[PDB]
């Protein structure tokens, strides 16, 4: 028994920007702030990561995955940990899990947008059917931008490391 | 013969709140609470109720242990709820039931709290127009007799002697149509969302 | 021997705060707190008072255990209060009373705070009305739109019906409990 | 022979903060922090300093146990403070004296901050009065040379600013919810 | 045998943050975050690093113990930082040490970021003035004093001296202590 520990935090503005712009494009000044977006992402992460963790404990060969606030009482950072049989085993699995979550959340979040790109086209292809016009021609520019952006399956990250998972030097006290 | 089952639940997403969020705009527009806020209020209402059920259940004659705690001690969401029982699927069954129980219990309270708002809005809006059109009549009956005070510009005054109102009052009457024609499906209002469904305990607890 | 009764309480209903909140609009228009903010205020004053009582009851020669805590840990509301006593009925009884004690005690301080200002603005508004009345006539020798506002707001101020049965600083989520079983000795 | 005294303390009420809040409006108007925000900031300062005292006192040869913790664990206000001492009446007196000690200490540190914000607004207001004047009068001379070959309130503000001396005696950083108690039982170890 | 030094730290004051905020009030102008927001971000950045240091220091062959926890439990600031070491004075100095070892580490990432931002704003206003010189040409091609403030600022930006030794991400509330007693089993 050896525990690897990573420390993680909300994705930085850079890591969101792609997704956040898409939201501006689609929603103007009703689009949520950058800050809120990062906050939402790490929320989504932790929330899913703690499910992984109940699940991992609820099996024949049980595993201890862990998410807690690094400074007890402070929203960020979050420090995650994992136990495995060998020092390098932990250090590698944690990382794998952190990524496993990230990916799975991210995927779902990309789905939301690629859904909204088509679900809020039904207001853009629905102003052409309203005509067939002064402020009305701005809708033509917005639909051009809602076409100009492409949500690549590698843009969104819902977390950022503060400390990459550790190689434990000592083994766990039993 | 004690096994806990746990679930992880969070605030309801926007879609599950659509119904109630709309009706709140229709009835209020500007001062109407943001989706964010509604979402929060809902989960808050759930968690509060579930923590009461919890207390009830422990003060039963035939004691039950149902719990609610923050999944990441310190973070507001998600909440992880758990329940101990006779058998593994007993726990898993009952957890779920109890979750719907609270959900529903609260969903009803909301639906009631809404039809209560439908009442108090209409009461004032009808009473506003009943004061607006009691005097916008009167002030136009004053004019038809303050001009009928004939003699200061003589012949032309007899030509001085069909109501159209502000588009401010025209809007109010149009919204009060929507507010009086607001339909509340209690089966549409959902108060929490799953992160993880109640678990089927593989092991068994013991101290 | 020792029995613990337990209520669960929360911030007052939007409706339960309505009169008070209104009275603050009439008295302050845009510096007047949101309903939501009065709600949170009120319960905060409840729990602070309730905390104090608790501490006092423990500092008696004849020791009493009254406690307040967040029902879901590290989640603001609801709060669950509890009382220990010698009989299950007695525990339930005394709790509800203490909750009421606190409620009323806070309410009447908040009442007295508002009735300070019904009295206080009827002084600060003749000092803007009857001051602008004779000071108009100093322009007549050597009427304002803001003056009628002052007149109107004062008219509203005197309409205010605030009996100390206005203020309610908490609502139950669950009324005190009748404990089947006593404490683990 | 150990006896714990206990006060419960909260943010100071709107009135005890009157001057300082007004003074903050005088210099910033619509961008001044809310009354509420000041109140919060004040008690936050009290608290932080109180916990310093507390750590300091527990590092004497002559150890003293003075503490501060939220009264409702998990809820920001009120917070309850306690002090242990040798004689019951001795605790109650010292606790209150300490509460007063911190209060005062902090008030002074806020007095300074008022002054520092005066002397930093002044030099940004004047430097924007001068830069609006001597760069828009060089636009009046780029209209005269084109013809050839409420900011007065910002000064009024500045006079109110100049006439904003605020007494030290007004500022209180906490309000009691419960004045420190006289312990009836003694502590059991 | 084993001794514990303790410091209490907070968010940095306006003064310590001025240098950095001024620079943001230039290049982002009115989209610059509030000082409140800046101070907040700083101490956040600090503690995040402090708790990483702590994680590393425990992992060393000879384990080392560095601590960060909220001074008043469940209150945001102040933080209580602490260090254990063999000797009294040694635990004091090495705390202080590890504290500045972080303050620096952070300031340097913040210098790196401001640098990066300067390089973006310069190139974002180069790319604007290369189109504005396609419109300044256009002015007397068919035959504002507002966009002459854009080039006027993009010089304050071009200037900006911001040395990483003038960026402080924490303030002491209490300097690391000299432990009178040793610890205990």
Swiss-Prot record, chain D:
Keywords: Cell inner membrane, Cell membrane, Lipopolysaccharide biosynthesis, Membrane, Transmembrane, Transmembrane helix. GO terms for molecular function: identical protein binding; protein tyrosine kinase activity. It is a multi-pass membrane protein. It is found in: Cell inner membrane. GO terms for cellular component: plasma membrane. One of its GO terms (biological process) is lipopolysaccharide biosynthetic process. The keyword ATP-binding does not apply. Pathway: Bacterial outer membrane biogenesis; lipopolysaccharide biosynthesis. Its main location: membrane. Residues 1-189 are periplasmic. Confers a modal distribution of chain length on the O-antigen component of lipopolysaccharide (LPS). Gives rise to a reduced number of short chain molecules and increases in numbers of longer molecules, with a modal value of 20. Belongs to the WzzB/Cld/Rol family. This is Chain length determinant protein. It comes from Salmonella typhimurium (strain LT2 / SGSC1412 / ATCC 700720). The gene is wzzB. The chain holds residues 54 to 292 of 327 of the full protein.
């Amino acid at each position: 028994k050896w525990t690897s520990t990573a420390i993680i935090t909300q994705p930085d503005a850079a890591q969101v920007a792609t997704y956040t712009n898409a939201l501006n494009v689609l929603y103007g000044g009703n689009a949520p702030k950058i800050s809120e977006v990062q906050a939402n992402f790490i929320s989504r992460f932790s929330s899913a990561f703690s499910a992984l963790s109940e699940v991992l404990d609820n099996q024949k060969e049980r595993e201890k995955l862990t998410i807690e606030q690094s400074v007890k009482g402070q929203a960020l950072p979050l420090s995650v940990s994992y136990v495995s049989t060998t020092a390098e085993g932990a250090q590698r699995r944690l990382a794998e899990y952190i990524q496993q979550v990230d990916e799975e959340v991210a995927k779902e979040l990309e789905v939301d947008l690629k859904d909204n790109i088509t679900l809020q086209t039904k207001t853009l292809q629905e102003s052409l059917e309203t005509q067939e016009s002064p402020a009305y021609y701005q809708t033509k520019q917005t639909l051009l931008d809602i076409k100009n952006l492409k949500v690549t399956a590698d843009t969104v990250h819902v977390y950022r490391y503060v400390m990459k998972p550790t190689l434990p030097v000592r083994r766990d006290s039993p």
